[PDB]
């Protein structure tokens, strides 16, 4: 079946046939739709089809379905799975799984630039302090002074999950939130009781806006351990205004990489709990969503003043003004110091063409809508207007929950 | 089989049992969401009416009720005996404000209740559709202090004697094909602004022009009708700071109203029910005034602030789309002609969604309409989830009608 997509700004016309590939389930049925909701151990018996629906995907990749190279692996994996229970990737589909598992991220506006990712594995990684040079190393690679560099760093696998590989932090680099007595809060809102735990990990907090947190790390399911990035290698960008000079007085500032650490990356069946990855900033995430969230550092008030706007009735638009203004700051000031950047315009436009060519060359695309729209100035971007489809392909990425809510305290 | 929707700004939690009432399908599956897709006989009618007047009965707390089952009666023999049905006068004004109370993709449903209701069953031509509609605008209008309202024309009977108002809203703009190869007036319009032209519509050729209404009764050939200038309430659209914003010659008109759905309550079809109440100020300022296919006016208003059209990345184009929806409120606002803002308005909405959470179990919502075209996650309808699924009494899309009307 052929499920067609429009563009009504363009009257594009695209069709897509690879939802016909897709497995796992939406949320959705043909009664309700899910698709504004944010969140809608593994017996040989289920494992054997995965691994096999993989390694058909990877070998049909390459051009090789159907050689002797392919059925011989289908036999070896077979083999070790009924008589380990699990498997063993190799290095040529680890990375093709991982670069997929991004390809396939329905929810992310980058994807044009899935091909082009860097991998480490760090499947022979055994303790905490292993993870942190992993992970250090990831971070300078990654940042690369400035000239950012798309990574994921890959720990074992699971494997009757009562021995996980989890990165504790949800972002390699985030800024602490405290909680203060008088029931307001210093620094980031949203990092509060990753903080607590931390402070009570041992972690001596300094206690200002912008403290960047210690890495939480746990190998081989052991209890976690804290871990101190080290300074240099946290790029960060002090943010000020091309014209209004106030701006800097502020106070602001952000990190350069932003690197989610907090996700479960399934390949062939296979589930690493610990797969920390990286790209680059779309201006947006920092200035509208980490900036101008009421529950983030909402400083929306403190820039309209300062912009003199009429803020006694929301009608002036002063929200909307001060909202523009501080992401032309964050762009300016990321520009300046040579940061890598791309802003919701250009980001946008850029997954049109990524999504027309997925079409073409693959079937389909699948994107969801609610993400993929910028949280500013949805309908100027050209993304507004295309019809897209949802749905789950394999490899992927998926939410997994936080490790202090399922964790079992050892000593 | 309960369904959760969290707001994570509040952490406020609520719990939907509406949905196990939803009766229509959505167009998704478990495989494939459809969530942004524009769009994705005698023995069926009897259970609708049913459905319907059990929920009437319902609301006026007399389920089961001698009067109930009396009803149920009276319309399972009219049915039986003609094919369809009428309803009362009160059945009609229930069912026309729960669609509204329905419409998933409506962010202004706070206001649900206050729906005047003008029942245009008994109308049996064009000439009377126009005067049926006029009242409305009138009294809609009410001066630019906007009263919401719908006119109800006669329901389907086989399908080939049906009532269309063929304009897609009351008042719209012309849109013309142009010898340049650009676009004189609206864009959206223009095909529409052809078929006007081609039943004999003397257009002036202008930005602006104020479109005939194109009016079918009982299934026969549509004819024009110039709703009457005075009745028509424009707004010049100026800038509070900006002098020279004025010279761009934009107006808009006060009055939205969508003429192009159909009305269905237990079973029946209303395939002319025009319905209109105020503007979100967003609707004008960022989709009319700003969409490429619409009249797209960014690149012509950021060169008079003069900011650098250079690179995207000095966000000209979202500067210049703050600066003509603050224009589009003022200017509104300035002729006291009712507007609401988007900030006013999705608060609203929210406040909105808890009363019928606690009140009647839920509320459909469409996110991806919900949220306003800019500035959404300032917005607190960004944070909320939603579920979307269909309820009846509904407004629905039909087909354009020349696409469909036998000629
Ligand atoms: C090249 C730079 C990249 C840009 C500009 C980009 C852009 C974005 C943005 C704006 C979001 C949504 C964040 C939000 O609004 O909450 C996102 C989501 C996501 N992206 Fe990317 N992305 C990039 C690279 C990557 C990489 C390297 C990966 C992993 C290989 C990735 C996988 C994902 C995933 C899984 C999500 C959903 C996150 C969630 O569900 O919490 N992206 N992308
Ligand atoms: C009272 C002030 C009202 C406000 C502020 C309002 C707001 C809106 C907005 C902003 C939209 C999205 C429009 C778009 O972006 O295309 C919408 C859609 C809609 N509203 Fe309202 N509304 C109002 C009154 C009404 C009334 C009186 C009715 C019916 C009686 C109604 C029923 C609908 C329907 C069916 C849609 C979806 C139309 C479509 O799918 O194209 N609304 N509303
Ligand atoms: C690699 C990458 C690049 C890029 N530009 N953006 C991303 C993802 C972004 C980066 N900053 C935070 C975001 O990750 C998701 C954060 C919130 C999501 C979330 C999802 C489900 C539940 C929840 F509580 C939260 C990843
Ligand atoms: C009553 C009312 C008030 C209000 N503020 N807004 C609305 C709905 C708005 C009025 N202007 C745009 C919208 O009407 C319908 C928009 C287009 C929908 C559409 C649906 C299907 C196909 C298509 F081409 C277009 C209705
Ligand atoms: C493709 C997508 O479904 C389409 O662009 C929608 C998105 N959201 C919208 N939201 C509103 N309020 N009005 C619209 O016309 C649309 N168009
Ligand atoms: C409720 C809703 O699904 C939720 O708040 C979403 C909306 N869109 C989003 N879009 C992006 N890019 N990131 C988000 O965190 C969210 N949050
Ligand atoms: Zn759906």
């Not at 289920?46 to 070998?59: G, I, S, T, V």
């Not at 070790?80 to 991982?98: C, N, P, R, V, W």
């Not at 996700?263 to 995430?285: D, H, K, N, Q, V």
């Not at 971007?381 to 394999?394: A, D, I, K, S």
């Amino acid at each position: 079946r052929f499920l067609k997509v429009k563009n009504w700004e363009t009257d594009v016309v695209l069709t897509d046939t690879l939802h016909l590939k897709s497995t796992l389930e939406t949320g959705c049925t043909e009664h309700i739709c899910m698709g504004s909701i944010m969140l809608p151990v593994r017996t040989k018996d289920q494992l054997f089809p995965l691994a096999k629906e993989f390694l058909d995907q990877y070998y049909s990749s390459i051009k090789r379905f159907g050689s002797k190279a392919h059925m011989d692996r289908l036999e070896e994996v077979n083999k070790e799975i009924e008589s380990t229970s699990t498997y063993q990737l190799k290095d040529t589909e680890l990375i093709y799984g991982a670069k997929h598992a991004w390809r396939n991220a329905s929810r992310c506006v980058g994807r044009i630039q899935w091909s082009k990712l860097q991998v480490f594995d760090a499947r022979d990684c055994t303790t905490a302090h292993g993870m942190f040079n992993y992970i250090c190393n990831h971070v300078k690679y990654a940042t690369n002074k400035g000239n950012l560099r798309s990574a994921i760093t890959i720990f074992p696998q699971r494997t009757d999950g009562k021995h996980d590989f989890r990165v504790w932090n949800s972002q390699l680099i985030r800024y602490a939130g405290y909680k203060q007595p008088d029931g307001s809060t210093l620094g980031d809102p949203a990092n509060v009781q990753f903080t607590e735990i931390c402070i009570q990990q041992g972690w001596k907090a300094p206690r200002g806006r912008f403290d960047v947190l210690p890495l939480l790390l746990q190998a081989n399911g052991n209890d976690p351990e804290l871990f101190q990035i080290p300074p240099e290698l946290v790029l960060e960008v002090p943010i000020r205004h091309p014209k209004f000079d106030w701006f800097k007085d502020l106070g602001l500032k952000w990190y350069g990489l932003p690197a989610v650490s907090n996700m479960l990356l399934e390949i062939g069946g296979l589930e690493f709990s610990a797969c920390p990855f990286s790209g680059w900033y779309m201006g947006t995430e920092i200035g509208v969503r980490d900036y101008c969230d009421n529950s983030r550092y909402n400083i929306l008030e403190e820039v309209a003043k300062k912009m003199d706007l009429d803020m006694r009735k929301t009608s002036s638009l002063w929200k909307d003004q001060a909202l523009v203004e501080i992401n032309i700051a964050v762009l300016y000031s990321f520009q300046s110091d040579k940061v890598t950047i791309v802003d919701h315009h250009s980001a946008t436009e850029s997954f049109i063409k990524h999504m027309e060519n997925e079409y073409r060359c693959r079937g389909g695309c699948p994107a969801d809508w609610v993400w993929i729209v910028p949280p500013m100035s949805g309908s100027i971007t050209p993304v507004f207007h295309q019809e897209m489809l949802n749905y789950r392909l394999t490899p992927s990425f998926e939410y997994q929950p936080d490790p202090w809510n399922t964790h079992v305290w050892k000593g």
